[PDB]
């Protein structure tokens, strides 16, 4: 209910802010969106045994049979006389010119299990279908359609840092490399440095690091049966888009030291907890407010190549609050300001 209230407040406050050049979504609004997605996942975690997917696909968050049974979706659609639902019906891909419209459209399409065209992600008659190609194509098409639509809006309104990442359940057996080489093969404009940089950073990282890395994994997440293995440093945008939080279950497979950023402090810095032992790590610290919650993990090791070592820098591992100071490209990346940071597990 608190997440829905925060969502309403964000939509009401950002309904007139026009999407312009060098605009970005604030940390508070990103945390609100993240909490909405997490509560939508948590409302119906598992699936009923009567209608179960033999492939292990998360049908409980993609099928209309489970969306309409989800109580969080019903409460979101009937919070205040369907005011959010009424505004949603007058929004499409080629008409959005405001930040609140962008957020409402993307989040409501995610939580209702519908694409931007209007079709559901996976139909109710294909829950128990054993055809792997059909379900895989549907999931990949849903994720690619979300990312494409965001990049199309980025090209049309000439914005640079608008980013609502596809959640973790829309990456079931979906190759990140294929997504990058299918979205950026056409629309060469997408390659411009002034159009869609955060989406480019999100897709490039998932094209070089797969969901499962077998024995090369140095870190693993787990949230309601969805897992993801990381070998490099995990920036804030990756965890924000995928939907994982630093307060979830984290499994260390190596003795390399990690820096789990949890929250911001009053000295314009970030507070982190350091772990350098094998085991299951779950941060005991209290969850901060939506304006002070940061999800980023940095691997302090030298085994990673210099080709992708720029992801571990402080100014790019955590998205800057100022829109013009957001660093996403490898060339524009700095590691400064560790004096402002602090340690919480002393």
């Amino acid at each position: 209910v608190a997440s829905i209230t925060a969502f309403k407040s964000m939509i009401d406050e950002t309904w007139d802010k026009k999407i312009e050049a060098n605009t970005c979504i604030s940390r508070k609004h990103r945390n609100i969106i993240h909490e909405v997605i997490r509560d939508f996942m948590k409302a119906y975690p598992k699936m009923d045994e009567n209608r179960k997917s033999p492939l292990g696909a998360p049908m409980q968050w993609l099928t209309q049979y489970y969306i309409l049974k989800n109580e969080y979706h019903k409460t979101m659609l009937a919070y205040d006389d369907g005011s959010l639902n009424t505004k949603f019906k007058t929004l499409n891909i080629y008409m959005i010119t405001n930040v609140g419209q962008y957020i409402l459209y993307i989040v409501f399409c995610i939580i209702s299990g519908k694409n931007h065209d209007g079709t559901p992600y996976i139909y109710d008659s294909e829950i128990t279908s054993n055809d792997k190609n059909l379900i895989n194509d549907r999931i990949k098409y849903a994720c690619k359609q979300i990312l494409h639509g965001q990049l199309t809006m980025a090209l049309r309104i000439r914005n640079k840092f608008m980013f609502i990442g596809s959640p973790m359940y829309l990456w079931f057996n979906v190759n990140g490399s294929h997504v990058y080489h299918e979205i950026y093969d056409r629309n060469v404009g997408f390659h411009n440095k002034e159009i869609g940089r955060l989406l480019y950073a999100f897709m490039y990282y998932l094209s070089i690091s797969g969901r499962f890395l077998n024995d090369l994994a140095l870190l693993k997440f787990t949230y309601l049966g969805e897992s993801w293995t990381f070998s490099l440093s995990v920036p804030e945008y990756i965890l924000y888009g995928l939907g994982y939080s630093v307060f979830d279950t984290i499994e260390k497979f190596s003795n390399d030291a990690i820096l789990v950023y949890i929250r911001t402090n009053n000295r314009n810095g970030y507070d982190y907890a350091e772990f350098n032992k094998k085991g299951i790590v779950k941060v005991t610290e209290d969850k901060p407010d939506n304006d002070k919650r940061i999800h980023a993990i940095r691997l302090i090791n030298y085994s990673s190549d210099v080709q992708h070592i720029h992801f571990g820098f402080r100014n790019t591992l955590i998205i800057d609050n100022e829109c013009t100071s957001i660093q996403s490209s490898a060339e524009n990346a700095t590691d400064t300001g560790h004096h402002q940071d602090s340690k919480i597990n002393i």
Partner: antibody
Amino acid sequence: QVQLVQSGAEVKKPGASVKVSCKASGYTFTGYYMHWVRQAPGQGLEWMGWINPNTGGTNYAQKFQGRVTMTRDTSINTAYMDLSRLRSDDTAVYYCARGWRYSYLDCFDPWGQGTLVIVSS
Amino acid sequence: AIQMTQSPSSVSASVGDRVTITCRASQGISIWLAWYQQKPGKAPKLLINAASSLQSGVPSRFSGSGSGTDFTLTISSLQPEDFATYYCQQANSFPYTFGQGTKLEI
């Protein structure tokens, strides 16, 4: 030295309730998970759940669901476990086990002293 | 629940021998296995975490190995203070199920 002093042995009756305390010293009570593992006489170890002292959240086992209420009082660094509807098979040495490292929900070290809760008529 | 089964339930040995304890899991539990040591009348003591890492204070004679559903605890040279009951502990899936126990006797 990390110490976990527990309460004395309690001779309860069937259908009653037992509250086993666990006082911690030598380490920061918040930040380390407190687990509760019992050992029946002549049997192995059974896991009951963990309690996070900093937040207050808990995760009980399905076998001990609806009967265990793990509370904490951070003013005395004391951990409390309450077990209701004591049957005859609940007689065991209830240990409180701190996590082996800071916010590590993997292994238990140390294990305290133990409380011989004898449920008999 | 992932049941843990320990094969050598009673392993007689002498001072200066090599003892092997095997703990097989019903389902894959990754590298998340913890070995304990419980002398009679005392609380259990952790000796090896993550199935290959020795805890601080544990003598170097203990050495663990294994992955998936096969694990092994090895004592290079047995000592008179190593005669106790040893337990496994998986942590991949809740609840954390222990083992039956293996006891060393002279």
